[PDB]
Amino acid sequence: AVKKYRPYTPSRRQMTTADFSGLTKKRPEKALTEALPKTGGRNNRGRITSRFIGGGHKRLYRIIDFKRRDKSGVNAKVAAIEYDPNRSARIALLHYADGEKRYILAPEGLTVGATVNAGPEAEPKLGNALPLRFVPVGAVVHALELVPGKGAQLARSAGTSVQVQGKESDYVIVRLPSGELRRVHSECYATIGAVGNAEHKNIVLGKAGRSRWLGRKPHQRGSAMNPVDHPHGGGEGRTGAGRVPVTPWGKPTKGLKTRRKRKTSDRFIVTR
């Protein structure tokens, strides 16, 4: 389900919003709040860098464990599954026996009260911290290290999955969300199952400035600018002639990767 509305305002007919009924309606845990809103409004040394970052609504950061390795061998009980305006991919509070509390990303299909287990020998049940070497072939997982320890770059957002392929001397093959295939060391941890909030995509923002609530400012087109301001500068009417970015280059098809190491670790073919 996702909410839809009657057309009582000219907006608000197309508009859509997520269903929150599964989210426990609680204040986030006080120890994990970190705060650190402090939005860096695209600015660097006062100077814009990621252009078009506006203000939006205020936010706190929810520290989220990613490595999950340190509490190997302890059981966890899933308390609340809960909202988070940073990940936009619902998180899940959990309590360990011995009483430490830390958030974890919520897998698709995980309910409140479920068991959660971490460590090397743990069984491939939903939401466990398993190193790749013990993952059964063809299982889907998310939340994935690139190097053992301090990893969780791969598969983190709504509905993303990592489909393990064959295995080698200590490297496993996996299918990333982008359709790339990649090697990864077998002691990297992963989390069983795809990501929760599996259908973030079909929310319909509806009106301008529903984006502003998300803090993304209006995104100017070149062709409305001036020759001074952008290469797609003026001239009486409307057109093209070259097709280039802000500062120049291509941006329809101009492969932008550098010629480097770890391209040998991305050794299976990559659409991207």
Partner RNA sequence: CCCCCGGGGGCGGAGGACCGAACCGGUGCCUGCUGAAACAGUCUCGGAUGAGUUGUGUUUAGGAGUGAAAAGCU
Partner RNA sequence: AACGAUAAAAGAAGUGAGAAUCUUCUUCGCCGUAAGGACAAGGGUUCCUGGGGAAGGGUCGUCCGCCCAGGGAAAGUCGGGACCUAAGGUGAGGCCGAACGGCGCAGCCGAUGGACAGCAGGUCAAGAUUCCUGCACCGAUCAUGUGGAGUGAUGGAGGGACGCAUUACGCUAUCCAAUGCCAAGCUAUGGCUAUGCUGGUUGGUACGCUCAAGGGCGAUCGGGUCAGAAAAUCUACCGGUCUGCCUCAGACGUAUCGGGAGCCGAAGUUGGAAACGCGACGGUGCCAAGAAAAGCUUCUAAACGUUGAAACAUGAUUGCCCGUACCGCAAACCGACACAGGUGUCCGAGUGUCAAUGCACUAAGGCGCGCGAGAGAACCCUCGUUAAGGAACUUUGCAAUCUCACCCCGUAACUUCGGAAGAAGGGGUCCCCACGCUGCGUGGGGCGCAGUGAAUAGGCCCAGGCGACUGUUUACCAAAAUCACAGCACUCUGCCAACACGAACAGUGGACGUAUAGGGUGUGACGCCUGCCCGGUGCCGGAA
Figure out which of the listed residues 247, 253, 264, 271 binds Mg ion, where binding follows CB under 5 A. 247
Cα 213 to Cα 215: distance, rounded to the nearest angstrom: 5
111 is in the binding site of which of RNA, Mg ion, none (Cβ under 5 to 8 A by kind)? none
Figure out which of the listed residues 154, 172, 174, 190 binds RNA, where binding follows CB under 7 A. 154
Q: Which of 158, 130, 159, 157 is nearest to 145 (CA)?
A: 130
Strand ranges inside 5-90, DSSP E = 16-18, 75-82
User: For residues 211-240, which are near RNA according to CB under 7 A?
Assistant: 211-214, 216-226, 228-230, 232, 234, 238, 240
Cα 57 to Cα 144: distance, rounded to the nearest angstrom: 30
Largest CA distance in the chain: 72
* Minimum distance of RNA from residue 207's CB (angstroms): 4
71 is in the binding site of which of Mg ion, RNA, none (Cβ under 5 to 8 A by kind)? RNA
Write the DSSP assignment of 198-239 as a string of letters.
Answer: TT-TT----STTHHHHTTB-----STTS-TTT-SS---SS--
- Is position 245 an interface residue for RNA (rule: CB under 7 A)? yes
22 is in the binding site of which of Mg ion, RNA, none (Cβ under 5 to 8 A by kind)? none
Sole residue written with tokens 């690139």: 146
214 is in the binding site of which of RNA, Mg ion, none (Cβ under 5 to 8 A by kind)? RNA
Sole residue written with tokens 């060391």: 185
- Is position 44 an interface residue for Mg ion (rule: CB under 5 A)? no
Q: What are the C-alpha distances in Å from 96 to residues 7, 78, 79?
A: 47, 9, 10
Cα 243 to Cα 236: distance, rounded to the nearest angstrom: 18
- Is position 89 an interface residue for RNA (rule: CB under 7 A)? yes
User: For residues 13-32, which are near RNA according to CB under 7 A?
Assistant: 13-15, 17-18, 20, 23, 25, 27-28, 30-31
For RNA, which stretch binds (CB under 7 A), given 116-124, 126-134, 165-173, 255-263?
A: 255-263
Cα 86 to Cα 83: distance, rounded to the nearest angstrom: 9
34 is in the binding site of which of RNA, Mg ion, none (Cβ under 5 to 8 A by kind)? RNA
Breaks (C-N over 2.5 A) in the chain follow: none
User: For residues 68-87, which are near RNA according to CB under 7 A?
Assistant: 71, 73-74, 77, 83-87
User: For residues 177-216, which are near RNA according to CB under 7 A?
Assistant: 177-178, 180, 182, 195, 197-201, 203-214, 216
- Is position 61 an interface residue for RNA (rule: CB under 7 A)? yes
Question: Which chain residues interact with Mg ion by CB under 5 A?
Answer: 219, 231-232, 234, 237, 246-247
